[PDB]
Design a protein around this ligand. Structure first.
Ligand SMILES: CCCCCCCCCCCCCCCCCC(=O)OC[C@H](COP(=O)([O-])OCC(O)COP(=O)([O-])OC[C@@H](COC(=O)CCCCCCCCCCCCCCCCC)OC(=O)CCCCCCCCCCCCCCCCC)OC(=O)CCCCCCCCCCCCCCCCC
Ligand SMILES: CCCCCCCCCCCCCCCCCC(=O)OC[C@H](COP(=O)([O-])OCC[N+](C)(C)C)OC(=O)CCCCCCCCCCCCCCCCC
Ligand SMILES: CCCCCCCCCCCCCCCCCC(=O)OC[C@H](COP(=O)(O)OCCN)OC(=O)CCCCCCCCCCCCCCCCC
Ligand SMILES: CCCCCCCCCCCCCCCCCC(=O)OC[C@H](COP(=O)(O)OCCN)OC(=O)CCCCCCCCCCCCCCCCC
Ligand SMILES: CCCCCCCCCCCCCCCCCC(=O)OC[C@H](COP(=O)(O)OCCN)OC(=O)CCCCCCCCCCCCCCCCC
Ligand SMILES: CCCCCCCCCCCCCCCCCC(=O)OC[C@H](COP(=O)(O)OCCN)OC(=O)CCCCCCCCCCCCCCCCC
Ligand SMILES: CCCCCCCCCCCCCCCCCC(=O)OC[C@H](COP(=O)(O)OCCN)OC(=O)CCCCCCCCCCCCCCCCC
Ligand SMILES: CCCCCCCCCCCCCC(=O)SCCNC(=O)CCNC(=O)[C@@H](O)C(C)(C)COP(=O)(O)O
Lengths: 221, 178, 459, 126, 99, 88, 170, 53, 62, 55, 76
């Protein structure tokens, strides 16, 4: 009976996702980021009479909120040291030890792309309907952290520590989520852990100095 | 879900519950139908060969070690039916099960949209209002002076009245009100 | 300023001379018009502050508070209309008189250019809130709540009076602009430290710290809906406004004297958000959320950064609007069920769809959502605090996580889930209370659209 | 090859030893608990599908839970050295810890700025 | 015990006035209060006030400061002056204490 | 579109179908009012297996207490009807 | 185009001429031609009508230059009139310097986007101007509080001049 | 008194008019430095009494 | 069985056996079906922790 | 593909294997949801109540 | 056939509130939006000019939009 509300929610998620993708400054990036999170909460808790669905939506909010903490740390550092929040001045700050912003962006990407440590919301969060599972947690929403890192790749290339820990984190989460996907019975759970494994593979590709291959795998996946 | 549990489960009930749970977990392990039938026949043979004991303590010890074995080698992710607790689509349509007293709060325009239904609903409300007093009188007359009272309810004893406390389960929402 | 004060003063004869069948209509309509009149001092073309009179003055800081007060008076009338329907006409007119006097005194307090007049109107506002809470509260504990509120405020405010008379005897004027221009540095003595404490602790009581804050949940639980509205949306901001005003004459020693209150604010916002997590009462949850947001405001004003002041003003206005909205929604459920227990009404999204929409928007405003002045204020407070010390980001992050958790916990446990079908007395909705939610939420959208108004003194 | 429970992931009713070594006293206790449950269920059902009911059901158990959680704690609080120590540490230890954290950080920052080893690269608005 | 009125039940307000708007018991005062709240609260203060705030010009000298900054930057660029001199006040009109 | 509704006759036919394919009983002796132990000669394990087969046939789980209450194909049919809200 | 290249510099675009070595038609060129003929022409006509109406009802607005009042340095302390005028002109200059900083930041962002991959090389003068204006802003307005004032700015400048004079002794 | 009855609707508008009058009276009360500030201090124009009323 | 007078203000409130609501019988229909608790039953002190939206204490296979 | 096809034919084979901790670890998601989602909410909520509110 | 009555809450009061709110908001804003569009199309948008010959402009003569100039002339 709420098919119109369902379609409107999907449209709102698409609008927020395209805002997040095409945003030029980190504030608009954050608008798209958190709008994607909120529409994810609603679409996971679509059947609001289901307690398990409500728990899944709440824990997705929790893990994405820890990612938001990392995002806010990066945003605040960039505001304090480059008074624009815009990617052009972010480019102009490419060689001044961006360890704190890159660590914050890595935490944000871990939260959104469900790497190890902040992973289980992605497999838990498809007790909602299957088109929600598909569009949200298989093609667009979970890409967002990897998209953030490929957006900040020119800063990323000058920090070897961030590249190494991205490679290690991505390898760990792709191995662990493939292991979890091996002995699973729910089809949605199998494809969710497969999605997490491919996101870990994109994180590995970002651990190398190849962001463009990671974005190619984003579209392909 | 329709019968209230007693004070305790008898030994026969506990054995039957263990048998059903063991067969379900056995199916979850051996997915394939022929393999499941083979091992289910083996499990039935084990229950049959421990069936006749004539010693309550020995039977209880057998049941205890069988439950120990079940918890030792149960399936960590067993098969759960949909519309069953723990499975997918368990409480899915609770968001659509509207509890039917909101029709009292419906506007006269909305009631005018469905005239025959609301005439039948008014007839049902009149029947409930007329039957409530005899329901209460029968429940008071039910012989429960002190002590052992179970959660069961009596039927309509005399001719012409209704079973007590019938409304909340006769007029419950449909399992898929879509 | 008189063109705003005098119509609000004439609201009282209108209230007492209107017919009993036209009192609410007349007072609500004319208070809406008074808010529209109070919109006229946003005409700030020059950087000069609008000094209308020798005793009344305007400000980019005072103006949003005045407009919020004048906007909130008709909202309080609408909210308090239903729970006074079985009441004497004299009592109804007296309640409306209390609300109108609160609006008049708060407008005069925010527009006052003298600290001693600010103090006088501060306690003048202390009176009718006490009368409202005690006379029209529901439970027994309203008398204890009134005692706690009144004497927390008074024990705070007496050293403020001593400090103000000390400053007047020292510099001769006690006028805000003269003090701002010929402010004098303090020679960092123990007497000056006690002077700083005396002039700060009144406002640190009025907007809650982690210490003295115990009056706020009691008063908010025991107060009626208009009392909760006026408290949580104006009076804490009145304390913050006083701190911003009086901090200018304490230049050299705030930078070390503000240390314990910054720590108190940060750890207290964490602890009060935790209480919101394990809180069984909806009004208590909203009250402790107010404590957390005002702790953020305290920390920003103490660190005294232009980003901190701007974020403090934005969080002041945003929190006033969203806390009043949350209180009104909770009051709608309480008027349905006559109990404030949170776990008791659960599946309300089924029967109240657009009220659930207002709940969802109010909670998305309660947590920091980036297209909102709530996130604007919280984010710039975070930026200023991280500039103050880089390690504050840990406390900020913990607070943000727990804030999202209690807001979404509120939504899930009071709107979603299986409906408690035994609650027959769930009337569909009042157009009045849906209008009340809309009149809370639409100004949030408009101020998000143009946040230059809510930016305070510093930029 | 044995299940070890804990406060989280407790012991099943199919594994606890009390289920198998039953006594007539425990059977009588179970029957009495069933009787209490049945009486409360009957009272609730009468109050629930009474047609003359125009309001909700008040739930005195929930009222007692709320009152015990809210307005009973200070009347039934007794100061002991244990809770005095707990209150002192929980109300002061975090404050002193974050005091020393922020104080050391700000003193280091101020010293670096005064000695010129810290440069604000493009920090114009703070 | 004392001679007290019992707790009154709360009536279904829609049982007698199905077009109830939340304001008053009798329908005429109720509908006129609804109309007064909507007209004075949405029509003339959420629209006219929004328009007035929108057409307040040069709010705290923002557009003036834009034009003045453009003029000063253009002047200092075409005249070769150091744009944004480091010292605000002229050093010749400031007297420093000796030694 | 999908999921055709089930009626009392279909429920009775499917229950009788499964019981006729039990192969332990019913040599053209089964009726709809035949008790599993009184005049079909079964026991509790057989009744549990019959309930399991009915659950696998209809795709939903009968809870244990109601399941052990069920003892005849007529009341199995009545239980499916009460759970699925048949004869709307 | 109210903006001028003196305050918002933009190098002249150098686009290369097409060399269609393939035989396939260009859908971009076809869509741009159709887009012009369908969208751009009616929009241009509407804007020309609107501009004709504006030229009929043409009116003017001015700039309001302020003249220099006596500053905080040349009048006595405790005189609230001179202090008020100096404070107002200092706040005016502060807002003007904020927008000067905004102009330089816009210029830097435009340089970075225009040059793209060569921003580390040919944006040298934009980055140099940004660094110099940042240094001057930090010298005049940085450490002032949320109650920043002409008196506080003067005190900061006098302290900085004292430190520079003391360093110039040795 | 031709309309009568609901006469109370002029109370708040009367208060608003009186408040505007009191603001005008305060503007007439201050009146110092009419053109004596260092910022504006312009000539009085061939046809103009005061700069602002 | 009340709390052992261990400081904080537990009065005569009972010590319920400290198990989450996930471990209640889910087939049995409860008066508070989301809470899995009947009307008039004593509420656990930590019902907020032990609701099905929150901390689970159900037995695990490992 | 070949290894998994061989293992699936081994599942076709009619014999019960002994359950291994590697398989239990994989099917219970590495125990990360159970362990973390039971120890972090319990400690956080219990600390929040039993200190922040009631102490 | 076999259409069943789905039980729904009373959405009439919700729809009535939304209809009334949109009605009043439209009832004033649509004339205001039309007036804004007509003013911007036909008049206004003052063009920046230099100060001529020592002329002293009016204060509203420093503002751009015609509605801003009208309010500044008639009220401030
Ligand atoms: C001289 C040499 C020997 C000294 C010695 O042996 O000291 C032992 C003595 C502890 O004695 P004990 O063996 O625990 O006493 C148990 C009773 O005999 C038996 O217990 P009882 O149950 O019979 O007694 C009831 C209750 C009697 O009731 C009470 O004690 C009431 C509570 C008193 C205050 C408790 C403070 C701690 C809680 C703070 C909570 C948070 C606050 C906000 C943040 O007793 C207690 O609670 C025992 C602890 C009493 C502590 C008294 C502290 C006095 C100095 C306080 C200084 C200021 C503190 C901060 C104030 C901040 C204000 C903003 O002190 C210490 O070990 C450390 C303190 C040393 C001095 C400082
Ligand atoms: C609600 C909060 C309550 C606690 C915090 C209250 C402030 C704590 C710190 C300030 C001291 C106490 C208040 C003094 C008010 C006047 C301050 C002032 O003018 O200082 C400058 C003056 C000094 O004057 P001076 O600065 O002109 O000194 C001359 C200096 N030379 C010569 C250099 C020019 O301080 C005092 O005179 C302080 C005397 C205080 C005597 C009374 C103390 C009463 C008990 C203290 C607590 C009272 C509140 C709590 C009561 C209990 C509540 C449960
Ligand atoms: C090689 C490199 C390796 C690097 C490794 C790095 C690891 C970093 C890990 C950081 C995060 C750890 C903590 C995560 C906690 C998440 C808790 C959660 O979401 O629990 C969900 C759970 C319900 O879910 P569940 O029970 O599974 O589902 C039932 C359905 N059958 O329960 C609930 O929903 C309960 C409701 C919430 C209760 C309140 C929770 C408040 C939490 C406040 C936390 C504050 C501190 C945060 C610190 C973050 C640090 C990054
Ligand atoms: C000041 C103190 C206030 C205290 C509380 C007061 C409460 C009572 C308020 C009474 C009325 C006062 C209204 C105040 C806000 C006015 C908004 C407004 O019109 O702003 C002007 C703005 C255009 O002005 P402009 O100068 O361009 O803006 C700055 C650009 N440099 O205009 C616009 O941009 C047009 C705005 C209206 C058009 C509709 C906008 C729709 C926006 C949809 C947003 C959707 C997403 C929302 C997400 C929310 C998430 C929580
Ligand atoms: C609640 C937590 C309270 C304790 C927090 C941790 C200790 C904070 C101490 C402090 O405020 O230190 C600042 C300052 C440091 O010393 P200094 O700057 O040299 O000042 C000499 C004073 N004549 O020390 C001082 O200025 C000494 C006086 C501090 C008074 C603090 C405020 C009163 C207590 C409020 C509670
Ligand atoms: C300023 C405020 C100062 C408050 C001082 C309070 C001192 C209390 C000392 C004391 O007796 O602590 C007892 C406490 C627990 O001991 P007990 O009460 O026997 O409880 C048994 C269960 N732990 O003992 C402990 O908790 C041991 C702590 C060891 C470190
Ligand atoms: C039907 C209900 C009402 C519908 C109203 C519809 C239009 C709403 C327009 C809203 C415009 C934006 C809101 C803010 C306007 C503020 C105007 C104001 O007070 O300006 C101050 C000014 C002071 O006078 P001043 O201009 O100094 O006089 C010397 C000449 N330069 O004052 C003036 O110049 C004179 C005052 C002009 C505005 C009067 C507003 C009065 C509102 C309160 C009384 C309403 C009574 C009911 C309606 C009566 C209708 C006849
Ligand atoms: C996953 C795999 C799980 C493996 C579980 C393996 C458990 C199998 C072990 C057994 O069968 S031991 C069974 C012990 N039970 C008894 O001794 C019960 C005997 N007592 C009786 O009264 C019995 O006659 C009955 C069967 C309970 C009576 O029922 P009738 O059919 O009415």
């Amino acid at each position: 009976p709420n098919i119109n509300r369902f379609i409107k929610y999907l449209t709102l998620f698409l609008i927020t996702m395209l805002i997040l993708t095409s945003a030029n400054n980190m504030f608009q990036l954050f608008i798209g980021w958190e709008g994607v999170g909120i529409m994810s909460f609603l679409l996971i808790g679509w059947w609001y009479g289901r307690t398990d669905a409500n728990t899944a939506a709440l824990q997705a909010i929790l893990y994405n909120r820890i990612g938001d903490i990392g995002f806010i740390l990066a945003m605040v550092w960039f505001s304090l040291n480059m008074n624009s929040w815009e990617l052009q001045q972010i480019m102009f700050s490419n060689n001044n030890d961006n360890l704190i912003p890159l660590m914050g962006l890595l935490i944000a990407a871990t939260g959104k792309s469900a790497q190890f440590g902040l992973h289980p919301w992605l497999p838990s969060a498809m007790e909602g309907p299957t088109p929600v599972s598909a569009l949200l947690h298989s093609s667009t929403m979970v890409v967002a952290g990897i998209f953030l890192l490929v957006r900040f790749h020119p800063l990323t290339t000058n920090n070897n520590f961030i590249l190494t820990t991205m490679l290690c984190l991505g390898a760990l989460t792709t191995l662990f989520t493939a292991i979890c996907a091996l002995t699973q019975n729910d089809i949605k759970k199998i494809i969710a852990f497969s999605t997490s494994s491919q996101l870990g593979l994109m994180m590995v590709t970002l651990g190398m100095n190849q962001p463009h291959l990671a974005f190619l795998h984003i579209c392909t996946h | 879900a329709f019968c209230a549990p007693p004070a305790y489960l008898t030994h026969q009930q506990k054995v039957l519950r263990l048998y059903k749970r063991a067969l379900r977990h056995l199916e979850s392990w051996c997915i394939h139908r022929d393999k499941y039938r083979y091992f289910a026949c083996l499990m039935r043979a084990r229950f049959e060969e421990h069936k006749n004991e004539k010693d309550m303590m020995r039977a209880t010890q057998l049941l205890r070690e069988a439950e120990e074995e079940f918890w030792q080698n149960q399936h960590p992710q067993p098969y759960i039916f949909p519309d069953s607790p723990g499975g997918t689509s368990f409480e899915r349509y609770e968001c659509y099960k509207v509890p039917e007293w909101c029709l009292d709060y419906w506007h006269p325009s909305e009631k005018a949209m469905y005239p025959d239904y609301f005439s039948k609903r008014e007839q049902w409300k009149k029947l409930r209002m007329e039957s409530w007093d005899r329901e209460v009188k029968q429940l008071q007359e039910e012989t429960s002076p002190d002590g052992i009272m179970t959660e069961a309810l009596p039927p309509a004893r005399r001719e012409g009245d209704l079973p007590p406390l019938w409304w909340h389960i006769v007029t419950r929402p449909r399992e898929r009100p879509t | 300023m008189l063109k705003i004060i005098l119509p609000s003063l004439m609201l009282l004869p209108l209230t007492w001379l209107s017919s009993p069948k036209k009192t609410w209509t007349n007072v609500t309509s004319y208070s809406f018009l008074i808010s529209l009149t109070s919109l006229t001092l946003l005409w700030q073309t020059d950087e000069n502050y609008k000094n209308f009179s020798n005793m009344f003055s305007s400000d980019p800081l005072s103006t949003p508070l005045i407009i919020l007060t004048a906007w909130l008076l008709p909202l309080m009338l609408m909210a308090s209309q239903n729970h006074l329907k079985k009441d004497n006409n004299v009592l109804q007119k007296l309640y409306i008189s209390m609300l109108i006097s609160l609006q008049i005194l708060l407008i005069m307090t925010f527009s006052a250019t003298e600290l001693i007049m600010f103090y006088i109107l501060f306690e003048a506002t202390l009176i009718p809130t006490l009368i409202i809470i005690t006379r029209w509260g529901n439970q027994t504990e309203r008398l204890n709540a009134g005692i706690y509120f009144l004497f927390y405020t008074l024990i705070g405010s007496i050293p403020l009076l001593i400090a103000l008379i000390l400053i007047q005897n020292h510099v001769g004027t006690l006028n805000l602009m003269i003090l701002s221009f010929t402010t004098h540095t303090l020679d960092a003595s123990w007497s000056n430290n006690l002077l700083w404490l005396a002039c700060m602790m009144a406002f640190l009581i009025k907007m809650p710290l982690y210490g003295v804050h115990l009056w706020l949940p009691k008063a908010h639980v025991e107060a009626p809906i208009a009392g909760s509205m006026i408290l949580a949306a104006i009076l804490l901001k009145l304390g913050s406004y006083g701190m911003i005003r009086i901090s200018i004459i304490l230049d050299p020693l705030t930078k070390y004297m503000a240390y314990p209150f910054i720590l108190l604010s940060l750890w207290g916002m964490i602890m009060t958000s935790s209480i919101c997590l394990r809180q069984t009462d909806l009004k208590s949850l909203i009250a402790y959320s107010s404590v957390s947001h005002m702790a953020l405001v305290i920390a920003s004003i103490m660190i005294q950064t232009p980003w901190s002041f701007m974020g403090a003003t934005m969080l002041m206005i945003a929190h006033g609007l969203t806390s009043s909205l949350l209180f009104c929604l909770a009051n709608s459920n309480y008027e349905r069920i006559h109990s404030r227990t949170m776990i008791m009404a659960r599946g309300l999204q089924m029967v109240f769809p657009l009220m659930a929409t207002w709940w969802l928007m109010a909670s998305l405003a309660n947590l920091a959502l980036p297209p909102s002045i709530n996130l604007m204020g919280e984010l710039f407070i975070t930026m200023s605090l991280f500039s103050w010390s880089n390690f504050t980001i840990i406390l900020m992050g913990i607070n943000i996580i727990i804030t999202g958790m209690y807001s979404m916990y509120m939504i899930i446990t009071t709107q979603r889930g299986k409906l408690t079908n035994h609650m027959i007395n769930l009337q569909p909705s009042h157009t009045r209370e849906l209008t009340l939610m809309a009149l809370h939420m639409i100004p949030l959208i408009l101020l998000t659209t143009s946040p230059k108004l809510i930016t305070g003194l510093t930029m | 090859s044995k299940y070890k429970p804990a406060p989280l992931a407790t012991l099943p009713s199919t594994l606890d030893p009390a289920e198998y070594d039953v006594s007539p006293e425990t059977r009588r206790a179970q029957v009495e608990r069933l009787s209490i449950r049945a009486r409360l269920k009957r009272e609730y059902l009468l109050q629930y599908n009474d047609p003359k009911r125009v309001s909700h059901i008040e739930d005195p158990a929930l009222i007692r839970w709320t009152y015990a959680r809210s307005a009973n704690i200070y009347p039934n609080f007794r100061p002991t050295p244990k809770n005095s120590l707990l209150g002192a540490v929980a109300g002061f230890g975090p404050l002193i810890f974050w005091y020393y954290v922020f104080k050391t950080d700000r003193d280091r920052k101020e010293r670096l700025i005064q000695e010129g080893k810290l440069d604000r690269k493009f920090n114009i608005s703070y | 015990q004392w001679q007290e009125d019992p707790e009154p039940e709360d009536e279904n307000v829609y049982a007698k006035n199905p077009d109830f708007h939340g304001y008053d018991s009798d329908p005429v005062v109720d509908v006129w209060n609804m109309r007064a709240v909507f007209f004075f609260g949405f029509s003339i203060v959420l629209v006219f006030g929004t328009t007035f705030v929108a057409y307040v010009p040069d709010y705290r000298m923002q557009e003036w400061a834009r034009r003045e900054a453009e003029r000063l930057v253009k002047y200092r660029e075409v005249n070769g002056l150091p744009i944004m001199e480091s010292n605000y006040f002229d050093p010749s009109k400031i007297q420093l204490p000796e030694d | 579109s999908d999921a055709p509704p089930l009626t009392l006759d279909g429920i009775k036919d499917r229950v009788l179908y499964v019981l006729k394919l039990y192969d332990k009983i019913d040599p053209e002796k089964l009726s709809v009012n035949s008790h599993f132990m009184k005049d079909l000669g079964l026991d509790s394990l057989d009744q549990v297996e019959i309930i399991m087969a009915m659950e696998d046939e209809f795709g939903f789980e009968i809870p244990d207490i109601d399941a052990e209450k069920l003892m005849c194909p007529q009341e199995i049919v009545d239980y499916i009807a009460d759970k699925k809200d048949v004869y709307e | 185009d109210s903006w001028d290249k003196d305050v918002y510099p933009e190098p002249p675009s150098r686009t290369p001429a097409p060399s269609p070595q393939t035989s396939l038609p260009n859908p971009i060129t076809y869509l741009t031609k159709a887009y012009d003929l369908v969208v751009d022409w009616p929009v241009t006509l509407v804007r020309e009508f609107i501009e004709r109406q504006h030229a009929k009802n043409r009116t003017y607005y001015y700039h309001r230059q302020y003249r220099r009042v006596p500053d905080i340095t040349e009048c006595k302390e405790g005189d609230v009139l001179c202090i008020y005028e100096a404070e107002m002109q200092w706040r005016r200059d502060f807002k003007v310097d904020q927008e000067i900083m905004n102009i330089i930041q816009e210029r830097l962002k435009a340089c970075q986007q225009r040059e793209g991959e060569n921003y580390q090389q040919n944006c040298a003068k934009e980055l140099e101007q940004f660094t110099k204006v940042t240094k001057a802003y930090q010298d005049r307005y940085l450490d002032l509080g949320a109650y920043y004032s002409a008196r506080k700015c003067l005190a900061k400048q006098k302290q900085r001049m004292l430190e520079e004079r003391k360093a110039a002794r040795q | 008194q031709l309309l009568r009855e609901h006469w109370v609707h002029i109370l708040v508008p009367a208060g608003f008019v009186f408040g505007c009058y009191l603001d005008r009276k305060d503007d007439e009360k201050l009146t110092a430095f009419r053109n004596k500030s260092m910022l504006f201090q312009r000539e009085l124009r061939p046809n103009e009494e005061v700069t602002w009323k | 069985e009340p709390y052992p007078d261990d400081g904080m203000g537990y009065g005569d409130y009972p010590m319920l056996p400290n198990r989450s609501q996930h471990e209640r019988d889910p087939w049995y229909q409860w008066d508070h079906s989301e809470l899995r608790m009947n009307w008039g039953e004593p509420i656990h002190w930590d019902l907020d922790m032990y609701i099905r939206n929150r901390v689970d204490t159900s037995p695990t296979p490992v | 593909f070949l290894i998994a096809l061989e293992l699936n034919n081994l599942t076709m084979k009619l014999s019960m294997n002994k359950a291994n901790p590697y398989s239990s670890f994989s099917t219970l998601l590495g125990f990360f949801p159970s362990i973390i989602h039971r120890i972090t909410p319990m400690k956080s909520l219990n600390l929040s109540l039993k200190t922040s509110l009631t102490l | 056939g076999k259409r069943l009555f789905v039980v729904k809450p009373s959405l009439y009061y919700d729809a009535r509130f939304l209809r009334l709110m949109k009605f009043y908001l439209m009832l004033t804003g649509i004339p205001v939006i039309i007036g804004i569009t007509l003013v911007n199309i036909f008049i206004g948008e003052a063009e920046l000019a230099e100060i001529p010959e020592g002329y002293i402009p009016e204060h509203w003569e420093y503002y751009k939009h015609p509605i801003s100039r009208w309010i500044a002339r008639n009220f401030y």
